[PDB]
């Protein structure tokens, strides 16, 4: 199928508390597998998936160093951007980075990204073409010029196509299990009483896995896209996820209303009523 290896990086300066906090978190397809954190007593790349304890010393050594290397590089970047935006050494600031690749059935690179944000907003990003940047502001325009002279995009294209794709292929062989696995949503509707001869019908999806799911309500074949409340998918904590979606309906008329469950581990979509 389609597959991704994505890295989420954070750097938070914290004046009067010493050096910034640094974090590299890695994901294969929504599955966290590695984490490195600069506050930990043992600041080192660590597994976070059974199938990662798979890897030998020489590899965890390697990454920890690269990450120590990356940490120092952002420490300067927090300072560089202070410089760019004319900001004092008094405020906490955040650098965020999304980094990685996606490959298709044939294991060929579909999309590659290097995405930066400062203080919770787009700073600079590598365009799909993997040759050009879009810059959010006059500040980012400096990095753009800089990285244009240094050939950053040339360098990053090579990584995303060569190295990323290759590391991704490994990790998937490292754990086929737990990763390809699917838990279907167990669904039901719940009746809840309300003022003014009305009912709230709540459609539940529980213990499913991968997070992605769709719950819709319909009245007589038609989706009630307004009218309908809907919490954000939440982790159960056990590896699975939960979600509900509800609607309001007059006592007696419950049966005119169907709930629908769409989840990539379901044969046909599910259909339910009270």
């Amino acid at each position: 199928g389609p597959h991704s290896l994505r890295y989420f990086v954070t750097a938070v300066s914290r004046p009067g508390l010493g050096e910034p906090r640094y974090m590299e978190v890695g994901y294969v397809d929504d599955t966290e597998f590695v984490r490195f954190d600069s506050d930990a007593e043992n600041p080192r790349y660590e597994p976070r998936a059974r199938w990662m304890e798979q890897e030998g010393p020489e590899y965890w050594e390697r990454e920890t160093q690269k990450a120590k290397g990356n940490e120092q590089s952002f420490r300067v970047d927090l300072r560089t951007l202070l410089g760019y935006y004319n900001q004092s050494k008094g405020g906490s600031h955040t650098i965020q980075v999304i980094s990685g690749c996606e490959v298709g059935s044939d294991g060929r690179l579909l999309r590659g990204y290097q995405q930066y944000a400062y203080d919770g907003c787009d700073y600079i990003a590598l365009n799909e073409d993997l040759k050009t940047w879009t810059a959010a502001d006059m500040a980012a325009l400096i990095t753009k010029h800089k990285w244009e002279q240094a050939g950053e995009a040339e360098r990053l294209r090579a990584y995303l196509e060569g190295t990323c794709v290759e590391w991704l292929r490994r990790y998937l062989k490292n754990g086929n299990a737990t990763l390809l696995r699917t838990d279907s949503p167990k669904a039901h509707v719940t009746h809840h009483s309300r003022p003014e001869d009305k009912v709230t019908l709540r459609c539940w999806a529980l213990g499913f896995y991968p997070a992605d799911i769709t719950l819709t309500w319909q009245l007589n074949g038609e989706e009630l896209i307004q009218d309908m409340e809907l919490v954000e998918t939440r982790p159960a904590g056990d590896g699975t996820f939960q979600k509900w979606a509800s609607v309001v309906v007059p006592l007696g008329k419950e049966q005119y209303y169907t709930c629908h469950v769409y989840h990539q581990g379901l044969p046909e979509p599910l259909t339910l009523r009270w």
Binding site: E24, E63, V97
Partner: peptide, 8 residues
């Protein structure tokens, strides 16, 4: 394996 970052 994460890339290594070029300074801004």
């Amino acid at each position: 394996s994460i890339i290594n970052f070029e300074k801004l």
